[PDB]
Design a protein around this motif. Structure first.
Motif, PDB file in Angstrom:
ATOM      1  N   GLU A  13      36.312  32.608  41.125  1.00 46.08           N
ATOM      2  CA  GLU A  13      36.597  31.683  39.974  1.00 46.08           C
ATOM      3  C   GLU A  13      35.413  31.554  38.998  1.00 46.08           C
ATOM      4  O   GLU A  13      35.611  31.503  37.799  1.00 46.08           O
ATOM      5  N   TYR A  14      34.193  31.462  39.478  1.00 43.99           N
ATOM      6  CA  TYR A  14      33.040  31.291  38.533  1.00 43.99           C
ATOM      7  C   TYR A  14      32.066  32.472  38.614  1.00 43.99           C
ATOM      8  O   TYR A  14      32.032  33.203  39.577  1.00 43.99           O
ATOM      9  N   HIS A  15      31.263  32.660  37.599  1.00 45.25           N
ATOM     10  CA  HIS A  15      30.280  33.807  37.617  1.00 45.25           C
ATOM     11  C   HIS A  15      28.933  33.352  38.189  1.00 45.25           C
ATOM     12  O   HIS A  15      28.180  34.159  38.702  1.00 45.25           O
ATOM     13  N   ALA A  16      28.624  32.079  38.087  1.00 47.72           N
ATOM     14  CA  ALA A  16      27.315  31.552  38.610  1.00 47.72           C
ATOM     15  C   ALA A  16      26.907  32.236  39.927  1.00 47.72           C
ATOM     16  O   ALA A  16      25.765  32.630  40.094  1.00 47.72           O
ATOM     17  N   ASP A  17      27.817  32.376  40.857  1.00 51.03           N
ATOM     18  CA  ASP A  17      27.470  33.033  42.164  1.00 51.03           C
ATOM     19  C   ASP A  17      27.755  34.541  42.103  1.00 51.03           C
ATOM     20  O   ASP A  17      28.315  35.120  43.018  1.00 51.03           O
ATOM     21  N   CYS A  18      27.380  35.187  41.032  1.00 49.91           N
ATOM     22  CA  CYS A  18      27.628  36.654  40.907  1.00 49.91           C
ATOM     23  C   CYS A  18      26.707  37.241  39.840  1.00 49.91           C
ATOM     24  O   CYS A  18      26.508  36.647  38.799  1.00 49.91           O
ATOM     25  N   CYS A  19      26.150  38.399  40.070  1.00 50.42           N
ATOM     26  CA  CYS A  19      25.247  38.997  39.033  1.00 50.42           C
ATOM     27  C   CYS A  19      26.038  39.622  37.872  1.00 50.42           C
ATOM     28  O   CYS A  19      25.532  40.466  37.160  1.00 50.42           O
ATOM     29  N   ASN A  20      27.259  39.193  37.657  1.00 46.81           N
ATOM     30  CA  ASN A  20      28.080  39.731  36.527  1.00 46.81           C
ATOM     31  C   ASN A  20      28.937  38.587  35.977  1.00 46.81           C
ATOM     32  O   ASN A  20      28.441  37.510  35.727  1.00 46.81           O
ATOM     33  N   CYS A  21      30.218  38.792  35.818  1.00 42.70           N
ATOM     34  CA  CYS A  21      31.085  37.700  35.307  1.00 42.70           C
ATOM     35  C   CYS A  21      32.417  37.696  36.060  1.00 42.70           C
ATOM     36  O   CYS A  21      33.142  38.672  36.058  1.00 42.70           O
ATOM     37  N   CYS A  22      32.768  36.612  36.689  1.00 46.75           N
ATOM     38  CA  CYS A  22      34.075  36.578  37.413  1.00 46.75           C
ATOM     39  C   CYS A  22      35.172  36.352  36.386  1.00 46.75           C
ATOM     40  O   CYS A  22      35.307  35.272  35.845  1.00 46.75           O
ATOM     41  N   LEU A  23      35.936  37.366  36.094  1.00 53.50           N
ATOM     42  CA  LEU A  23      37.014  37.215  35.078  1.00 53.50           C
ATOM     43  C   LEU A  23      38.386  37.276  35.753  1.00 53.50           C
ATOM     44  O   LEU A  23      38.478  37.076  36.946  1.00 53.50           O
ATOM     45  N   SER A  24      39.428  37.553  34.986  1.00 56.84           N
ATOM     46  CA  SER A  24      40.845  37.644  35.518  1.00 56.84           C
ATOM     47  C   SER A  24      40.914  37.619  37.049  1.00 56.84           C
ATOM     48  O   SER A  24      41.483  36.716  37.637  1.00 56.84           O
ATOM     49  N   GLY A  25      40.320  38.581  37.696  1.00 57.54           N
ATOM     50  CA  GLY A  25      40.331  38.599  39.185  1.00 57.54           C
ATOM     51  C   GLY A  25      39.294  39.597  39.687  1.00 57.54           C
ATOM     52  O   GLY A  25      39.592  40.430  40.515  1.00 57.54           O
ATOM     53  N   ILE A  26      38.078  39.525  39.187  1.00 55.35           N
ATOM     54  CA  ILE A  26      37.018  40.491  39.630  1.00 55.35           C
ATOM     55  C   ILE A  26      35.674  40.181  38.944  1.00 55.35           C
ATOM     56  O   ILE A  26      35.630  39.771  37.797  1.00 55.35           O
ATOM     57  N   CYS A  27      34.578  40.383  39.636  1.00 54.67           N
ATOM     58  CA  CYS A  27      33.229  40.127  39.020  1.00 54.67           C
ATOM     59  C   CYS A  27      32.880  41.293  38.093  1.00 54.67           C
ATOM     60  O   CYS A  27      32.510  42.353  38.541  1.00 54.67           O
ATOM     61  N   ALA A  28      33.010  41.110  36.808  1.00 58.67           N
ATOM     62  CA  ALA A  28      32.706  42.221  35.851  1.00 58.67           C
ATOM     63  C   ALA A  28      31.482  41.888  34.994  1.00 58.67           C
ATOM     64  O   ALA A  28      31.372  40.789  34.483  1.00 58.67           O
ATOM     65  N   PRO A  29      30.599  42.844  34.854  1.00 58.61           N
ATOM     66  CA  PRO A  29      29.377  42.637  34.037  1.00 58.61           C
ATOM     67  C   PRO A  29      29.679  42.754  32.527  1.00 58.61           C
ATOM     68  O   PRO A  29      28.986  42.181  31.707  1.00 58.61           O
ATOM     69  N   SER A  30      30.685  43.506  32.152  1.00 60.47           N
ATOM     70  CA  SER A  30      31.015  43.680  30.694  1.00 60.47           C
ATOM     71  C   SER A  30      31.549  42.372  30.075  1.00 60.47           C
ATOM     72  O   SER A  30      32.706  42.281  29.707  1.00 60.47           O
TER      73      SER A  30
END
Length: 46
Positions: A13-30
């Motif tokens: 759900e959030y990107h804070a706990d990921c070195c990219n961005c949690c979007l639709s349904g996956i941690c994406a850096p773009s």
């Protein structure tokens, strides 16, 4: 101690706990030019 960061693709759900961005349904850096999510700017420096 190390920081809290997982790889990309990891869906969540959030990107804070990921070195990219949690979007639709996956941690994406773009997510820092056309889609708003998490500005990966070199701010956390030392």
């Amino acid at each position: 101690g190390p920081s809290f960061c997982k790889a990309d693709e990891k869906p969540c759900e959030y990107h804070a706990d990921c070195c990219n961005c949690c979007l639709s349904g996956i941690c994406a850096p773009s997510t820092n030019w056309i889609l708003p999510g998490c500005s990966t700017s070199s701010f956390x420096k030392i």
